[PDB]
């Protein structure tokens, strides 16, 4: 994170409220901010051993030196809502073999992890073949 | 009962099907008499594989 004017200040507060309020909110107030698909995942789910991830992120964020990011926490889970608390961590996300690392921005909140790591080569061609 | 399904396993060749059908039949005779002599005489004197269901009352 090194951005400005994307969740506080002049230009952009996250649907009328700053990041600072979100962190003090429970999930209950947070989900009522319009993003329909998110609300399913919380109200139904309520932690199906996402426990393993969310403790490692906070932990590693704490122990890491000031003005420096942590190492990585890795996942095969490409599914989990990006949240304000998660921001500042660095996460490697399994594709089919490869853990593509990404920094979490406050501007990515609401999205999934798996949108920021691709799982195919974009494509080139080609020279049509024989048949 | 209709069943309309492929005639070819592992589909190849001209596309064909096969209609099978089963026809059930129902019919019922209503008696009003003492339940004893009915349940006595009913269950006997049946040669073929044909089902019978006795009911206490319906009317």
């Amino acid at each position: 994170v090194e951005q400005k004017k994307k969740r506080t200040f002049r230009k952009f507060t996250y649907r009328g409220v700053d990041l600072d309020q979100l962190l003090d909110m429970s999930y209950e107030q947070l989900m009522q901010l319009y993003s329909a698909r998110q609300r399913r995942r919380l109200s139904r789910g309520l932690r199906r051993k996402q426990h393993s991830l969310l403790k490692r992120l906070r932990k590693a964020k704490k122990e890491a030196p000031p003005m420096e990011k942590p190492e990585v926490v890795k996942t095969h889970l490409r599914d989990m809502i990006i949240l304000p608390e998660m921001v500042g961590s660095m996460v490697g996300v399994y594709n089919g073999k490869t853990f593509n690392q990404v920094e979490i921005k406050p501007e990515m909140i609401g999205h999934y992890l798996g949108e920021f790591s691709i799982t195919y080569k974009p494509v080139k061609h080609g020279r049509p073949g024989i048949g | 009962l209709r069943i309309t399904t492929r005639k070819t396993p592992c589909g190849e060749g001209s596309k064909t099907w096969d209609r099978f059908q089963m026809r059930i039949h129902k019919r019922l005779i209503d008696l009003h008499s003492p339940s004893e002599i009915v349940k006595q005489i009913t269950s006997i004197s049946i040669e073929p594989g044909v089902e019978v269901e006795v009911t206490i009352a319906d009317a």
């Binding site: - | 069943i3 399904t5 005639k7 396993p9 096969d18 099978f20 089963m22």
Partner: protein, 53 residues
């Protein structure tokens, strides 16, 4: 040993199985089938049906 061996199968094409040997691929349910279309044919003579049309 292990603490897992299974994962939710509750719907879909993997939580029902057809009676060849536990064969699949050949999705089947009809009127209480659970009976494989290849063998259904071999039971045209057997009881359930006699072909008439």
């Amino acid at each position: 040993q292990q603490l897992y061996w299974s994962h939710p199968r509750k719907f879909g094409q993997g939580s029902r199985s057809c009676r060849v040997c536990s064969n699949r691929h050949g999705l089947i349910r009809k009127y209480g089938l659970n009976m494989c279309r290849q063998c259904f044919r071999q039971y045209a003579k057997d009881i359930g049906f006699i072909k008439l049309d």
